[PDB]
Design a protein around this ligand. Structure first.
Ligand SMILES: O=c1cc[nH]c(=O)[nH]1
Length: 225
């Protein structure tokens, strides 16, 4: 059972297709849109429905050049680690045994381990946070979260900040494992993100059900000859 299986009918809905047409228009209107069109759905590409172990919800994609590439909180290789990710790495360094500060902010290897890095809004106008928040992306990601709720068992949801917490209100807290904390951005991280211990807690839950825990130290694609 795949994303396409469960999302094919949602993807033929006017709200969804129209969201995409608005983006495609915007990309030609004089404005740059992030991430590139081929990257918008990368969270789905790297972590199939049946591979989802951890869901980390973000809200908006990074809105600067070279930053967003379709995975919540991640940036491309060579790009500076943005403040929300830095605070994530800090909590990790203080909680996960052996973890040290990565020299990059690329989280693809989290996704390849089953960490679904899903923003509720999947595109953004350059430099303008929340600029596409009233297209239909929230309806689409509402549906995505609902399907995960329904079609999977024992997934851990990490819900950072009020927006994500509301988004995840529908999730079965008996069938899945839901953890809440304030958002890791500088504005709220010292008001409960630090100390939330979500990364260890996720791993323990996974372990207690026979699943491999997540290696949260992210790794860059390697060099070849
Ligand atoms: O992808 C991202 C980046 C920053 N903030 C979010 O919520 N998600």
């Amino acid at each position: 059972l795949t994303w396409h299986d469960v999302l094919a009918e949602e993807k033929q809905q006017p709200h969804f297709l129209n969201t995409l047409q608005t983006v495609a228009s915007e990309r030609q209107s004089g404005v740059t849109i992030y991430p590139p069109q081929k990257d918008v759905f990368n969270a789905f590409r790297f972590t199939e429905l049946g591979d989802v172990k951890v869901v980390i919800l973000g809200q908006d994609p990074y809105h600067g050049p070279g930053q967003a590439h379709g995975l919540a909180f991640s940036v491309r290789p060579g790009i500076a680690i943005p403040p929300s990710l830095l605070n994530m790495y800090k909590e990790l360094e203080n909680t996960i045994p052996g973890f040290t500060r990565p020299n990059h902010g690329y989280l693809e290897s989290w996704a390849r381990q089953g960490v679904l890095l899903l923003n509720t809004v999947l595109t953004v106008r350059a430099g303008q946070a929340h600029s596409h928040a009233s297209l239909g992306w929230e309806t689409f990601t509402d549906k995505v979260i609902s399907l995960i709720n329904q079609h999977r068992e024992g997934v851990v949801f990490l819900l950072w900040g009020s927006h994500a917490q509301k988004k995840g209100a529908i999730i079965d807290k008996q069938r899945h494992h839901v953890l809440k904390a304030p958002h890791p951005s500088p504005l709220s991280a010292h008001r409960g993100f630090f100390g939330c211990n979500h990364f260890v807690l996720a791993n323990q839950w996974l372990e207690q059900h026979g699943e491999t825990p997540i290696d949260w130290m992210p790794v860059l694609p390697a060099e070849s000859e």
